[PDB]
Amino acid sequence: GFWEEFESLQKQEVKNLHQRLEGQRPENKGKNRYKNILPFDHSRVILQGRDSNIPGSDYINANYIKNQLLNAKTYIASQGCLEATVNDFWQMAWQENSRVIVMTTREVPYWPEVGMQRAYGPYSVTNCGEHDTTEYKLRTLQVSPLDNGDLIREIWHYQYLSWPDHGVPSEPGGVLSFLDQINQRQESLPHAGPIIVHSSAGIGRTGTIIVIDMLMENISTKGLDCDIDIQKTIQMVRAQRSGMVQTEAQYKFIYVAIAQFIETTKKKLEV
């Protein structure tokens, strides 16, 4: 009954076991969209090339996320940029060798318009084209260090357009198609660093997208015959960034999406 359930939930606490010192530093206050949504120190992304004598200079609100129930894909779960952290975001993308960025919100932009080139700190970003579907945009970005134009990286920016405010999509087909494109892209780049995924707080839509993708990967890799434990998968990612999958609606969407993924996959096999 109550005490058994309570005891179980207490077993799942992580914020008591993992500190969030860096994100709470006063010097980093302007770098968090929400003062109470912060990265665990242990898995945070540390920005390189910064001066430790500038308090907080290495900080970004983002964590590495791995499928740790297990060569699976790796991720970074990041909060969406503030005006003050756009350069930090590009520093993260560059240093991590990320070639795929997944943005789950509609429009602070951090890319130029098609055919245009802009500087973000030490980096140049060029928008080499945009291609749309009914639910998302794909922008092809080319990034280089400002001082070295001979060094160019193609970065594929996927922006989902139709996720409802304060809810989830009514059907999961759009997200499943979106993730299929993302997976194929990442798989085509064996040396690529983690896929960066972001949303306003970097936990709700972000955790939902990441968990669905990890489950699709488990299914593709281990088979339709494999055990799917969504609750366990969610807890495993929450130990890496607090609050991943934040709402009842998101939680239910994961089940709805994976159920449809399985059923469609099966139907295709049996045609």
Side-chain angles (χ1 to χ4, degrees):
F2 172 81
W3 287 108
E4 184 172 340
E5 298 158 15
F6 171 83
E7 159 185 46
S8 301
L9 283 165
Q10 289 296 351
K11 294 191 196 97
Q12 288 179 334
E13 281 298 291
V14 288
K15 61 175 185 53
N16 295 339
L17 297 192
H18 297 302
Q19 286 187 280
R20 296 165 299 151
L21 281 189
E22 300 297 325
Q24 301 179 291
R25 301 191 180 271
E27 48 267 48
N28 293 324
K29 199 163 182 284
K31 299 177 191 174
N32 301 316
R33 178 172 283 100
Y34 309 104
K35 84 178 69 171
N36 293 313
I37 299 173
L38 301 172
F40 286 135
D41 289 338
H42 80 85
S43 53
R44 77 188 181 101
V45 182
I46 301 175
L47 301 179
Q48 303 176 353
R50 297 291 171 96
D51 181 2
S52 59
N53 287 332
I54 299 300
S57 64
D58 76 8
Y59 179 81
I60 189 166
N61 195 323
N63 298 91
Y64 301 112
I65 314 289
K66 308 260 194 312
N67 192 331
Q68 280 176 351
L69 297 178
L70 312 184
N71 56 11
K73 301 185 298 300
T74 61
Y75 314 82
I76 286 168
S78 181
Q79 66 162 31
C81 293
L82 302 162
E83 308 95 276
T85 69
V86 171
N87 298 341
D88 295 338
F89 181 90
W90 280 115
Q91 172 58 42
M92 172 173 68
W94 187 266
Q95 79 184 34
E96 303 295 332
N97 195 35
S98 294
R99 302 298 176 108
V100 182
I101 299 174
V102 181
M103 166 171 186
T104 63
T105 53
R106 294 188 295 272
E107 307 183 55
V108 172
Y110 49 90
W111 56 85
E113 293 302 296
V114 172
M116 313 301 295
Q117 178 183 19
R118 293 236 306 109
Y120 303 90
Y123 304 102
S124 167
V125 177
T126 300
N127 182 339
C128 294
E130 173 183 341
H131 302 265
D132 292 19
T133 73
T134 58
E135 296 125 357
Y136 71 85
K137 298 180 179 186
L138 172 58
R139 293 177 175 90
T140 300
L141 303 183
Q142 284 182 12
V143 187
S144 57
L146 279 175
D147 56 27
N148 191 4
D150 299 326
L151 199 50
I152 297 164
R153 293 184 185 171
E154 287 194 293
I155 290 179
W156 306 86
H157 184 259
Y158 288 86
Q159 174 180 25
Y160 206 78
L161 300 178
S162 62
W163 199 297
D165 302 317
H166 277 240
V168 298
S170 47
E171 304 295 345
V175 170
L176 294 169
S177 170
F178 181 64
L179 289 177
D180 174 65
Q181 296 292 337
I182 287 157
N183 296 161
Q184 289 186 24
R185 182 75 61 183
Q186 179 77 357
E187 296 170 35
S188 79
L189 303 166
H191 298 309
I195 301 173
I196 291 165
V197 182
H198 74 79
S199 53
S200 189
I203 56 172
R205 303 185 189 185
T206 293
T208 304
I209 282 284
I210 288 174
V211 167
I212 291 170
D213 196 74
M214 285 181 172
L215 296 168
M216 294 168 62
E217 176 151 13
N218 294 344
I219 295 168
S220 304
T221 295
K222 306 191 176 305
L224 265 48
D225 211 318
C226 80
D227 202 46
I228 295 297
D229 195 330
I230 287 170
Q231 288 177 289
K232 178 195 280 277
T233 300
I234 289 176
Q235 282 311 129
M236 174 275 297
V237 303
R238 286 175 178 173
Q240 297 174 78
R241 183 166 168 88
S242 192
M244 296 277 280
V245 187
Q246 192 54 213
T247 69
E248 158 222 71
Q250 287 159 4
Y251 178 77
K252 286 168 179 176
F253 186 73
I254 295 176
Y255 278 81
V256 171
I258 292 307
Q260 180 158 313
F261 182 67
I262 289 169
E263 299 198 49
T264 300
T265 301
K266 294 188 294 188
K267 290 183 300 180
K268 292 186 175 162
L269 300 174
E270 307 175 21
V271 57

PDB file of all heavy atoms in Angstrom, residues 64 113 149:
ATOM      1  N   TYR A  64      25.357  14.896 -20.860  1.00  0.00           N
ATOM      2  CA  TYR A  64      25.475  13.667 -21.635  1.00  0.00           C
ATOM      3  C   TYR A  64      24.414  12.675 -21.187  1.00  0.00           C
ATOM      4  O   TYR A  64      24.207  12.493 -19.980  1.00  0.00           O
ATOM      5  CB  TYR A  64      26.845  13.032 -21.390  1.00  0.00           C
ATOM      6  CG  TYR A  64      27.983  13.925 -21.769  1.00  0.00           C
ATOM      7  CD1 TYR A  64      28.833  14.461 -20.805  1.00  0.00           C
ATOM      8  CD2 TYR A  64      28.216  14.236 -23.099  1.00  0.00           C
ATOM      9  CE1 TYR A  64      29.877  15.284 -21.155  1.00  0.00           C
ATOM     10  CE2 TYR A  64      29.258  15.052 -23.462  1.00  0.00           C
ATOM     11  CZ  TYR A  64      30.082  15.580 -22.499  1.00  0.00           C
ATOM     12  OH  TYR A  64      31.111  16.400 -22.906  1.00  0.00           O
ATOM     13  N   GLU A 113      19.638  32.720 -41.898  1.00  0.00           N
ATOM     14  CA  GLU A 113      18.642  32.393 -42.911  1.00  0.00           C
ATOM     15  C   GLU A 113      19.315  31.757 -44.129  1.00  0.00           C
ATOM     16  O   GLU A 113      20.527  31.823 -44.283  1.00  0.00           O
ATOM     17  CB  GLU A 113      17.861  33.645 -43.326  1.00  0.00           C
ATOM     18  CG  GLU A 113      16.974  34.197 -42.213  1.00  0.00           C
ATOM     19  CD  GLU A 113      15.960  33.176 -41.717  1.00  0.00           C
ATOM     20  OE1 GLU A 113      15.088  32.770 -42.512  1.00  0.00           O
ATOM     21  OE2 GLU A 113      16.040  32.771 -40.537  1.00  0.00           O
ATOM     22  N   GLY A 149      38.767  28.526 -42.449  1.00  0.00           N
ATOM     23  CA  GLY A 149      37.694  28.229 -43.378  1.00  0.00           C
ATOM     24  C   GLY A 149      37.891  26.949 -44.171  1.00  0.00           C
ATOM     25  O   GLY A 149      37.002  26.534 -44.912  1.00  0.00           O
TER      26      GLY A 149
END
